[model samples]
Target: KVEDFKEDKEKAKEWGKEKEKEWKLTATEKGKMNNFLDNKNDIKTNYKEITFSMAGSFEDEIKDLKEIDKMFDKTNLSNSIITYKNVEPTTIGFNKSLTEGNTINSDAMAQFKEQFLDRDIKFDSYLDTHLTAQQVSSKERVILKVTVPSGKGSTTPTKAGVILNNSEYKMLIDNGYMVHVDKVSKVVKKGVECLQIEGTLKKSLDFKNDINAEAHSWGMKNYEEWAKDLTDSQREALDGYARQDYKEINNYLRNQGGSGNEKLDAQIKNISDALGKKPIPENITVYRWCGMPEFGYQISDPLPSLKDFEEQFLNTIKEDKGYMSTSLSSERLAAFGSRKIILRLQVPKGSTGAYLSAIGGFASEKEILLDKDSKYHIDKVTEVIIKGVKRYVVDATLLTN
Candidate 1:
């Protein structure tokens, strides 16, 4: 007699894994997630996390890992990162009186302050050089070195910290107040850059010492819930009139590069000559923008002619498919790639050269050019314009008077 064995179960399991791998496979899913396409990654190790699952593809990470690393850039694989602007937590906005919101335990708060204030934690010896050496075109991130001095606490810090990297963020592990490093990129300058930090377990810290399961609730819990009964569409537009982001785009590139051009050079000569060296009644830095017919953060966007931005982006998709979308190249979303401008002018010492310094991002077009001699050097761009909106943003610094 023959012995008949049913192997369909094993085959079914393999089939399921294959399907998952395909969906999860990144735009270039090769290393960690190639298992779905094959059956080899039944066991692997060392993957910290997968930030974006290619928009809707979350199946790529199910494979068991044999090794993983921290330097991975997921966007390089294949996924579009979308911003919902500010996500409401405690859901959106609510005022929290100190007494009403979460409180710090006397003992734990003391411990936390002690941990953060200590400089015994080594800082990168070359941090300053690294920070300043980065050109205006470089991506910026904050990096903090923390000393565990001991082992990781229980629960492996699944989500104890938020890492603001480049333009996006991710949850991070905890090794005692997680390494205080951040990554910022684009549009914002170093000194006046916007800084945001989140994802701390203050209550968890208190619980560690207090040993009471009753941890304090956060400032969010008390947020009076509103808009619970609206239809989905109405719910979305609750805060309507918030979509005019193009206005901000124009404000960012005001005085930096729009200074130089044969046409602009003549215009500056005309403006300054017209002023006839009288100087501002108070002698302030004189400034101007490109294409004098009109100028600002957004000399081009909304293309109002199009229903949406995908068409707008195709017009400017100069970058390859493997890269992330920058605001200058954003198909139809015309509100990004804007930087801020701030300039200050000190009165020239008896006809001497004027001093100029600027700091800010997309909030407005702030510039200073009292020198009149070398302050006009704007970069000319031959961008892909849709109906008149630019498709890509290319930046070049004009280091001048």
Candidate 2:
């Protein structure tokens, strides 16, 4: 079984050793000596912490740290403490506030509360006297520490620290602090070592402009070459032809009972054949709506039972199984009929169908064209309410060869 070590270096090494011994058994029984140390080394290295520094800081680092404390207060992160040893030298520590069921040392606790929460201690007291004015004016380091409880199931110091850092990266403009990641290392928290992050505040570094410029350059490089190469007239003419063809095809599909013309039938056949070469990539559901009269029921006549309805519907589909126009959008089909049919289609890869909207039709009806050989398996018929009006719904699946 694959298991996550949760950044435990010792446990991962032990597990790796066990796996190595198991691999060695095969050498004597069925194979020659196993010389590969790579597998064991890979496992051992997987849990080792790799630290990297970056030039950025969380917006309101202290506030965000405090927020994290509150957010995970009920978990292992509770009772955690962050300490600034010397505001001037900027040494900071992160650890559990106290051992289990014990309080932090009273004097240290009072000092921490006074400096950070109460805001009574003067930071100048910690300043060095030998420093020049410019050196003294520079921003000090910011340290953030998180305490982890023992015997963790999921939560870990590294995971929490990553969330804090990522949240800062997500909104770097308005809330960014002028600082760079100085160091990240493991610190002892509640007698258990965990992760800590430190940042050195700087006054003259901006990452936003660099990030924006890089993003814009990437977009330009990866843009569609064919679309960019099209002239305005060529694009316009293509768009016009698509719109005209969609309108004509849609009108022909809707008026299915109109007297047939050889030219129109030929055009339909050409389009269907062109579309058949490109089948939908996966299964999909499409809908078609026709008036009750199309099924031999008048507006005033009572609707047929489920069995009778399915029989009539299947017979009608079987009789004319010709090129059919359907919409992927159910709402668009609802207005055309008092009866609704939902067809769950299993469009195998490499089968044929055409989506009109993909060819630059501005019409919002996601029209799909199915070839003449399409067949269906009627599943069930039921009634559903749409906008406070009752309508009959037929559930079916489009059969695939």
Kindly give the number of clashing pairs for every candidate. Answer: 37, 0
Model 1 lDDT, full chain set: 0.22
Give the candidate number with the greatest lDDT: 2
Give per-residue CA lDDT, model 1, range 4-87, as digits (tens). 112243443343333233232333433333332133442222111111011222234422221111212121211111111111
lDDT of each: 0.22, 0.34
Best by TM-score: 2
Model 2 TM-score, all chains together = 0.35
Off by over 4 Å in 2: 1-260, 299-302, 310-322, 332-334, 337-350, 362-364
All candidates: TM-score = 0.18, 0.35
- Model 1, 7: alpha-carbon shift in Å? 51
